[PDB]
Amino acid sequence: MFLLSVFFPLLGGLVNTSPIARFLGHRGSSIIAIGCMVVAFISSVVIYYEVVFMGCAVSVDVFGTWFSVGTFHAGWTFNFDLLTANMLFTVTGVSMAVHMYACDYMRQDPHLNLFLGYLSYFTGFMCVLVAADNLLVMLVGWEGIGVCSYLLIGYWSHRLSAVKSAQKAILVNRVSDGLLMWGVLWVWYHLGSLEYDLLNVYSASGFVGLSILIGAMGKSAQILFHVWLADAMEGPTPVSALIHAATLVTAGVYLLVRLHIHDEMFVIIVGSLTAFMAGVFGATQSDLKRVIAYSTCSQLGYMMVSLGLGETGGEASMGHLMTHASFKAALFLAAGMVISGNGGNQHIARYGGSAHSAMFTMLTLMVASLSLIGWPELSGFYSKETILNLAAICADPIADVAHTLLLLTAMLTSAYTTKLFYQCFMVDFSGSSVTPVRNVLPILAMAILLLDIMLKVWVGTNLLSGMLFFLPWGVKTLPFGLMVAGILTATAAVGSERFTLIRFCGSRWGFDQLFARSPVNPIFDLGRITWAIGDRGLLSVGNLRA
Amino acid sequence: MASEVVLALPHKLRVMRMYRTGLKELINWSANRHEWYPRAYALRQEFEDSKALTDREEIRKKLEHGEELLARFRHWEPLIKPEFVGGTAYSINPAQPKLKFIPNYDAMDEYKKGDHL
Amino acid sequence: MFISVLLILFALCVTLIPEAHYHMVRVWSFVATIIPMWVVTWMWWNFDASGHGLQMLVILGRSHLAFGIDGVALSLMLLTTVLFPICMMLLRTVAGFMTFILLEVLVLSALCVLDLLGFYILFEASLILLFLLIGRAPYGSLEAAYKIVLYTMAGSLVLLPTLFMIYSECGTTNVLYMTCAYNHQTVLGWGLLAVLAVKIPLMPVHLWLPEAHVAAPTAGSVLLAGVLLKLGGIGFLRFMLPVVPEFCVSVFPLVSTLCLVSFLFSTLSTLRQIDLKKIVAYSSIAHMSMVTLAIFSQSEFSAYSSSFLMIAHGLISPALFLIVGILYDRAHTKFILYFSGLGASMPIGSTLFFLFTLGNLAFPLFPNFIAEVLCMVSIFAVHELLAYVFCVCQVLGAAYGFWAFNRVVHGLPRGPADVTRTEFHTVLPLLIGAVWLGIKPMA
Amino acid sequence: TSLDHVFGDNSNKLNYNFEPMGMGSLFIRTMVMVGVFFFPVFIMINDDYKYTSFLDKVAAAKAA
Amino acid sequence: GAGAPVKLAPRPDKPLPTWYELWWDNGYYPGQPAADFMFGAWPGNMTETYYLRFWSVFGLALAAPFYYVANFTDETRMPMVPQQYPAEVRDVLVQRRNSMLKHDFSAPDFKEVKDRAKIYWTPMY
Amino acid sequence: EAKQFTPDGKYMPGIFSKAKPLDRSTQWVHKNPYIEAWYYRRDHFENEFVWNYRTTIEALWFLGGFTAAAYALSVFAFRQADRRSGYPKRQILGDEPAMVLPDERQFY
Ligand SMILES: CCCCCCCCCCCCCCCCCC(=O)O[C@@H](COC(=O)CCCCCCCCCCCCCCC)COP(=O)(O)OCC[N+](C)(C)C
Ligand SMILES: CCCCCCCCCCCCCCCCCCCC(=O)O[C@H](COC(=O)CCCCCCCCCCCCCC)COP(=O)(O)OCCN
């Protein structure tokens, strides 16, 4: 059962993209994709119960040695331990519902089986990433999900902005991939191996944690790397759900939790600044998918700070990752159903009422939104409150500012999520297209993720749930009051007259515009210099006329 | 200040474009359409208070000030219907143009299908 | 040796076939390059990997011209014998067949020679053939042919007196006794640097490549990119490092800064290119700069990693030249502005273009990924910053690669129809070699 | 021109001269880029300087 | 709805600029710059001077509290010491520079553990 | 509506035929004159080099400047490698007689 969680989504992708799919068509390829995900989810459930609960890790030599020159030895080997089982359960369970949704959402697309094969490849490379036992097979998974993210973001290739969004995701992540590669070189040079179980670091040379942190900041879309994440909304809604829940953005946090070789000052500062920035960014957007994208960036900031706190903080970071994937995928699927019910419009000024959506879509948005804002005794309450209480008792003075930033971020999140519900359903109608979707497949796709939200409350992620870190009632129940403050403010729909702050925040602090000329235009101009002045000029040798 | 296109317009069409863009920017800055209706009424009453003017200098000063206001309050995220330019559904799955086909190209003039030297 | 004489004499019989038998001429010239591929595969079978460094030796008396096999020469010979029948599939005249047959004889004998004067005689005897191949009258460029021939001649003329200096110093040009005698290493080191820094494109003596590799036909571009640049690398590994090692240590800051500026400035120039063949042509300079710095690091397993990068480049860049050659053959232009939407009109060709784009950018499951990792291990072990320079500049390679792919493959569908059976089978051996060498290269 | 009344016409042209950036702007932004993207070089140079000045202090106060 | 109409981009009918490869013309109207916001009007008509001017205050407004707590506040602000361990368990836990147990001011080797948690960059020889 | 094959194979050239045969040049592009002119100009851009102020200044600060930066970095890396390996100062090109090439029979 253990190799069935990794191979078999890759097999589904291989089937649906090869000339076998010429004989199946759309109708047969949908069956193949859904079955190939159901099998992998069943295998991951067995792996989860064996490794997490009964504590028996399994190591598999899959395809022998990859390459071995000198003392640099990379093998095709997996290891299934606690983190790997957690990640496999989360990835396969989310990707199954996203496949069941995409087989109905992209029904009218002309190349449906190609899209399903790309989704399966993306899932399989994520499984390869988390199942690897050494750094090089991890890099296979890293670049595989990067390539499949490029193929899926720029799926509608006749649209130029989608193509440029895919290229932007590739380039922004390529900077951090370079830094991560140099960090792998440092790690191997000063420890002698590439396998995770032999990488126990107490005191290393600083470049190790910094360069691995930069490589993780690329994929997890932290500060000065978040710019690709918002533009990745050019792709279809299943792509966004799988990018923001289970694949891609959770890979850097997984890598930092696995290695635990960071220096906590950088991690805490980057995470808290990212959380506050993405909180204020999502409060001032009107595109329905961009608000959810910025909430993803904000929660990744929370997890970054938590893994900065310590080993218990690393466990809480993995726990928040696991519970975040379910309600984030549910939020994106419900938003896709609302968009399709309103004629493709993504602006929240053109919604309202309870006619453009099913009852189940509204229930899904409500329950996932309540889990995200930390409503008591739902799924996100346990993990988010654990991170907040662990940040309130850290003995680092830097974590004092980080906790304040997290509390402000919590109020902002409960503001804009309540605004997303309020604009979508509570206000009067201001669109003109009412085509509500009530198909069986997307409704069952949403119901599965709501079942996982219930499961996280009933069965915890780890042993931290129910442990009491001893805090006064004032410190403990303040995030509930911040949630209520966000709800009351957003339902009052109040606004400020400070329009220059509004347009500074709504334009997202001008990061893209400043990047358009601080590295980008200089790279183009230095290329002009090296070609025209150097190759055609200073180094050019002419002819002798006679 | 207006762009080089709007500065080339006749005066009637210049004022009409200013009123139209003001209504659209009020749509962009509002939360809903039901928020937008009394702001649209107020903008209409604002233009009605300068209808009976004759002095071209006062007309020019009011026109230029309003164009400066519209350049200031240009929304960074305008509301565009999805299937038009700048919308989210523009240029996704267009019908293919007619592409020509050459049947059995390898079988035409075999043994002489390389590059000359 | 007797086998090599038989293969040469069988290859030279293409001229005696009467031209009115077209099928026979095609089949004979294709088989004349198929047979050495089988013989070199057999030589790989015969090789003892736990034996001596030099195996299958032969020396022809007092005429120089001594031959032997090591691992680098054997891998490069296998790559050349793969690449030459694909070139045979892209030619149509007996003049082209004979030029490529003579080029194959000279390349194969130059790759495994053990005499410096023999290397000089065998390699640049191909100069006039390259001049005629590049400056062909209706569709070539005489300016490019003049540039490549004059740069190569300049470097070779710098080497030739230093070759003769060590020959008078010790009494031989055999590399086994040149490495064991006392010689004036600064002079000979400068001569060897002069040839091999022109063969490998190293700035500032690199301006011949953008003209020659574009003005050449598709077969000429496949040969020039995949094979002839690596003669500089095997020159470093076979002749210069064993015979003048004190020079090779003392010149390391200069060779190091030449490699760093070649990598950075050639990557910066590749971004402003507007010709697809010129885009593919510039990208080879940065890869060869990484090869040269990995050779000169001499640090962990430097010969292994640098040879593996030479093989990975020699597999991936000829395929990109083949795809550009298909586009040029059936659309009569190489200009980016005339191509858009090639995914809808050539889905198989665009898929092959994407896979070889990913391979050229050293993504995993391609031999370039393993190659660049091991080359940076060899570079890192001297100093961490010399590795950091190559690591942080990976966004600059991906920028031009994905920009060229996205400009020509997506958008409005205009351009030629998809590939034929012949074009697919020109591409196909390189793809199989890439999948094998990027997944299970060793056992 | 069959869709110009639906999506707009080609009369409005792009206002850009396709000219290179100014020399001082290019120099300043390149220096900032070198400082940001090559910060390990400056870190290691500072390490070498801080190490050699300590050995200078040792060699100064030792031979007295 | 596949097959929606889309307007085509015209071909050049005038001499081209020298550095024309900064426009992305994919075949449909409108084309774009090679990188967005490199030229043309920015969204909301803002400029680079606007963002740099607002950031010259806003950046120190965000970097101010971290500096204050990192230089004017220490471990003794906490009402309790870190989690206590037996010596055989603690002695390996505080070997990590990453650990939050080095902020235990009641430990007998508090100073020595803090002096061993200084970050270095170049490994010495 | 040409016929370039007989019913049993057998390609026909159609040299004297009225209908236009499909062949290798069927999909050759129609050349835009301005695109051809721009590509020709970029192909011969070495005729446009001139030693004005901007060319001289950018060739000094970027080309010579980064070449000197890379030479300084290479020498720095060489010296640091020799110090971290237990070697004395070693003779690069133009550096007076010193140690080159460590002995394998020696412990450093
Ligand atoms: C400097 C070492 C040589 C390494 C060069 C890199 C080779 C590139 C690919 C890596 C393959 C590794 C193969 C390892 C086992 C093969 C046999 C072997 O041992 O290798 C030989 C040589 O290996 C080769 O020749 C490998 C051939 C690789 C070339 C592949 C490219 C050509 C194929 C093109 C695609 C064909 C597809 C056709 C199908 C349609 C000797 O090398 P060493 O073990 O270092 O020699 C030992 C040294 N001593 C005797 C002193 C003790
Ligand atoms: C264009 C990009 C496309 C991307 C494609 C997907 C991503 C791929 C990424 C990784 C690629 C690795 C592929 C390796 C191929 C084989 C390498 C091993 C060769 C070999 O002889 O090994 C034996 C083969 O075993 C076996 O192979 C098992 C025996 C047969 C039983 C299972 C059959 C396979 C079913 C797979 C279903 C589909 C999965 C899709 C990946 C195993 O033994 P060893 O010698 O290594 O000994 C050690 C343990 N005994």
3-class state of residue B116 by DSSP: coil
**CA gap B50, B28 in Å, rounded:** 25
Q: Alpha-carbon torsion A247, A249, A250, A255, what sign?
A: positive
Q: How many other C-beta atoms lie within 10 A of the C-beta of residue C56?
A: 14
**Cα nearest neighbour of F67 on chain C:** C261
Nearest CA owner, ligand 2 atom 2: C365
Give the residue among A537, A149, E102 at the shortest CA–CA distance from F54: A537
Give the residue among C163, C153, C83 at the shortest CA–CA distance from C119: C163
Phi, psi torsion values for E4, nearest 5 degrees: -70, 150
A182/C402 Cβ within 8 A: no
Resolution for this model in angstroms, one decimal place? Answer: 2.8
Give the residue among C236, C230, C235, C194 at the shortest CA–CA distance from C371: C230
Q: How many other C-beta atoms lie within 10 A of the C-beta of residue B42?
A: 10
DSSP state of F99: B
User: Which residues are bridge partners to C113 per DSSP?
Assistant: C67
Query: Please, what is the angle between helix C94-111 and helix C127-134, to 10°?
Result: 140
3-class state of residue A58 by DSSP: strand
Concatenating the DSSP letter of every residue in A116-173 gives HHHHHHHHHHHHHHHHBSBHHHHHHHHHHHHHHHHHHHT-STTSHHHHHHHHHHHHHH
F60: which chain A residues are within 8 Å (Cβ-Cβ)? none
What Rg value do the Cα atoms of chain F yield, rounded? Answer: 33
The kind and range of the H/E element at F5 are strand F5-6
**Cα nearest neighbour of C371 on chain A:** A67
C407 touches chain A (CB under 8 A): no
**CA gap C242, C239 in Å, rounded:** 6
B108: which chain F residues are within 8 Å (Cβ-Cβ)? 4, 11, 23
Give the residue among C408, C402, C142, C393 at the shortest CA–CA distance from C275: C408
Give the residue among C33, D41, C360 at the shortest CA–CA distance from F80: D41
Nearest CA owner, ligand 1 atom 29: C75
What Rg value do the Cα atoms of chain A yield, rounded? Answer: 24
**CA gap C65, C172 in Å, rounded:** 12
Which tokens sit at F1? Answer: 């509506």
Spacing, Cα B7 to ligand 1 middle (Å): 72
What type of residue sits at position C20?
A: A
Longest CA–CA span in chain E (Å) reads 83
D16/E122 Cβ within 8 A: no
**CA gap F96, F92 in Å, rounded:** 8
What's CA C221's distance to the chain center, in Å?
10
What type of residue sits at position A87?
A: M
List CB contacts of F82: < 8 A, sequence separation 6 or more: F88, F89, F90
CA distance D17 to chain A (A): 15
Cβ(C301)–Cβ(A69) below 8 Å:
yes
3-class state of residue F105 by DSSP: coil
The structure tokens 């005698």 sit at: C181
D23/F58 Cβ within 8 A: yes
Question: Long-range contacts made by residues C121-128, C-beta under 8 angstroms, separation at least 24?
Answer: C121/C64, C121/C65, C123/C231, C124/C152, C124/C153, C124/C156, C126/C102, C127/C152, C127/C153
Identity of the residue in F45, F48, F59 whose CB atom sits nearest the CB atom of A538:
F59
Exposure class string for A512-535: b at 16+ Cβ within 10 A, else e: bbebbbebbbbbbbbbbbbbbbbb
Give the residue among E122, E118, E102, E120 at the shortest CA–CA distance from E110: E102
Cβ(C251)–Cβ(F93) below 8 Å:
yes
Cβ(A33)–Cβ(A116) below 8 Å:
yes
E30/B91 Cβ within 8 A: no
Which tokens sit at A421? Answer: 């519900």
Q: Which ligand is nearest to the CA of A4?
A: 2
Write the CA distances from F44 to A60, A462, C207, C211, integer angstroms: 60, 68, 14, 11
Cβ(C47)–Cβ(C84) below 8 Å:
no
Q: How many other C-beta atoms lie within 10 A of the C-beta of residue A349?
A: 21
Q: A434 — alpha (psi -120 to 50), left (phi > 0) or beta?
A: beta
Angle, CA E114 vertex, CA E110 and CA E119 arms, to 5°: 170
User: Which residues are bridge partners to C59 per DSSP?
Assistant: C66
The structure tokens 């000045």 sit at: D53
List CB contacts of A497: < 8 A, sequence separation 6 or more: none
Chains that touch D (3 or more CB pairs under 8 A): A, B, C, E, F
Half-sphere exposure of D7 (CA within 13 A, CB side): 21
Identity of the residue in C384, C385, C392 whose CB atom sits nearest the CB atom of D37:
C392
A524/C265 Cβ within 8 A: no
What Rg value do the Cα atoms of chain B yield, rounded? Answer: 27
End-to-end CA distance of chain F: 84
Concatenating the DSSP letter of every residue in A31-44 gives HHHHHHHHHHHHHH
Give the residue among C44, C41, C39 at the shortest CA–CA distance from C55: C44
List CB contacts of A127: < 8 A, sequence separation 6 or more: A5, A6, A9, A10, A40, A88, A91, A92, A141
Query: Please, what is the angle between helix D23-37 and helix D39-62, to 10°?
Result: 70
List CB contacts of A546: < 8 A, sequence separation 6 or more: none
What type of residue sits at position C319?
A: A
Q: A324 — alpha (psi -120 to 50), left (phi > 0) or beta?
A: alpha
Q: How many other C-beta atoms lie within 10 A of the C-beta of residue A24?
A: 15
Write the CA distances from A144 to A11, A120, A177, integer angstroms: 15, 12, 12
Cβ(A131)–Cβ(A92) below 8 Å:
no
Which tokens sit at A359? Answer: 């009852």
Cβ(C440)–Cβ(A63) below 8 Å:
yes
What type of residue sits at position E14?
A: K
**CA gap A535, A537 in Å, rounded:** 6
Q: How many other C-beta atoms lie within 10 A of the C-beta of residue A116?
A: 30
**CA gap A469, A393 in Å, rounded:** 9
Chains that touch B (3 or more CB pairs under 8 A): A, C, D, E, F
Is the peptide bond between E79 and the residue preceding it cis, with omega within 30 degrees of 0?
A: no
User: Which residues are bridge partners to A72 per DSSP?
Assistant: A69
**CA gap A412, A295 in Å, rounded:** 10
Half-sphere exposure of B60 (CA within 13 A, CB side): 4
Q: How many other C-beta atoms lie within 10 A of the C-beta of residue E37?
A: 19
The structure tokens 């490998």 sit at: C200
Angle, CA A215 vertex, CA A213 and CA A220 arms, to 5°: 85
3-class state of residue A531 by DSSP: helix
Chains that touch F (3 or more CB pairs under 8 A): A, B, C, D, E
**CA gap E16, C37 in Å, rounded:** 49
**CA gap A19, F50 in Å, rounded:** 57
Concatenating the DSSP letter of every residue in C213-278 gives HHHS-HHHHHHIIIIITHHHHHHIIIIIHHH-HHHHHHTHHHHHHHHHHHHHHHHHHHTT--BHHH
Cβ(A224)–Cβ(A312) below 8 Å:
no
**CA gap C293, A84 in Å, rounded:** 39
Phi, psi torsion values for A69, nearest 5 degrees: -125, 120
**CA gap A165, A153 in Å, rounded:** 7
Which tokens sit at E117? Answer: 């948690």
A432 touches chain B (CB under 8 A): no
Cβ(A281)–Cβ(A292) below 8 Å:
no
Nearest CA owner, ligand 1 atom 8: C308
Longest CA–CA span in chain A (Å) reads 96
Which tokens sit at F56? Answer: 């001289």
Q: Is C90 in the pocket of ligand 1 (CB under 6 A)?
A: no
Give the residue among A348, A261, A253 at the shortest CA–CA distance from A296: A253
Angle, CA C160 vertex, CA C156 and CA C166 arms, to 5°: 140
**CA gap A242, A123 in Å, rounded:** 8
Cβ(A403)–Cβ(A392) below 8 Å:
yes
Range list of β-strands (E), A352-506: none
**CA gap A68, A88 in Å, rounded:** 28
